[PDB]
Design a binder for this molecule. Structure first.
Ligand SMILES: COCCOc1ccccc1-c1nnc(Nc2ccc(CC(N)=O)cc2F)c2ccsc12
Ligand SMILES: [Mg+2]
Ligand SMILES: [Mg+2]
Ligand SMILES: [Mg+2]
Length: 133
C-alpha cells in the first residue's frame, strides 16, 4: 500500500487562539494498541510539541514502569524499541512518520482547536512494508 507524506501545517507556530487552549504547554492523547485483536489504551499527557518518537518513548516509559528502570536503562530501552513502532490516526490511513511537533500534524492541531481528544494507534513499523515486485 502506498504511504502518504505527513499531513502537517506549514509552520510549527500555533495561531494564538489554538496556543491559548494549551494547558501549561501540554495536551492529552489516547494511544491504542491491538493485543485476539483485543484493544488496550494509554492516556498520556505530553508537551504539545513532542515529536512522534517522543510520544512512543513516553508510552515505553509507562509500559516498563514496573521494571524500576534507571534513567540510563530507560534511555537504552527507548533507543532499542522506539523505532520498531509507528503512530497512526485512528480511523484513517495517515501516519506520523516524520519529525514534526505533534501539534503541527493537522489532526492534532484540529483536536486542540476543538477540545477533542486525539486517538492514535501504535502499530509495528513492519505493517507499512510492501513486498518487492
Ligand atoms: C506488544 O505490544 C504492542 C506494542 O506495545 C507497546 C509498544 C511500545 C510502547 C508501548 C506499548 C504498549 N504496551 N502495552 C499497552 N497496554 C497493555 C497493558 C497490559 C497488557 C497485558 C500485559 N502486558 O501483561 C498488554 C497491553 F498491550 C499499551 C497501550 C498503549 S501503548 C501500549
Ligand atoms: Mg497555560
Ligand atoms: Mg492509562
Ligand atoms: Mg485505526
Amino acid at each position: 500500500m502506498y504511504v502518504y507524506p505527513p499531513n502537517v501545517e506549514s509552520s510549527p507556530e500555533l495561531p494564538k487562539h489554538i496556543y491559548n487552549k494549551l494547558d501549561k504547554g501540554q495536551i492529552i492523547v489516547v494511544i491504542w494498541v491491538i493485543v485476539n485483536n483485543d484493544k488496550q489504551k494509554y492516556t498520556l499527557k505530553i508537551n504539545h510539541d513532542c515529536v512522534p518518537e517522543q510520544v512512543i518513548a513516553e508510552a515505553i516509559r509507562k509500559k516498563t514502569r514496573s521494571m524500576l528502570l534507571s534513567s540510563e536503562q530507560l534511555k537504552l530501552c527507548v533507543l532499542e524499541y522506539q523505532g520498531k513502532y509507528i503512530l497512526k490516526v485512528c480511523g484513517c490511513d495517515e501516519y506520523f512518520l516524520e519529525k514534526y511537533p505533534l501539534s503541527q500534524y493537522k489532526y492534532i492541531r484540529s483536536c486542540i482547536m476543538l477540545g477533542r481528544m486525539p486517538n492514535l494507534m501504535l502499530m509495528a513499523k513492519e505493517s507499512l512494508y510492501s513486498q518487492l515486485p
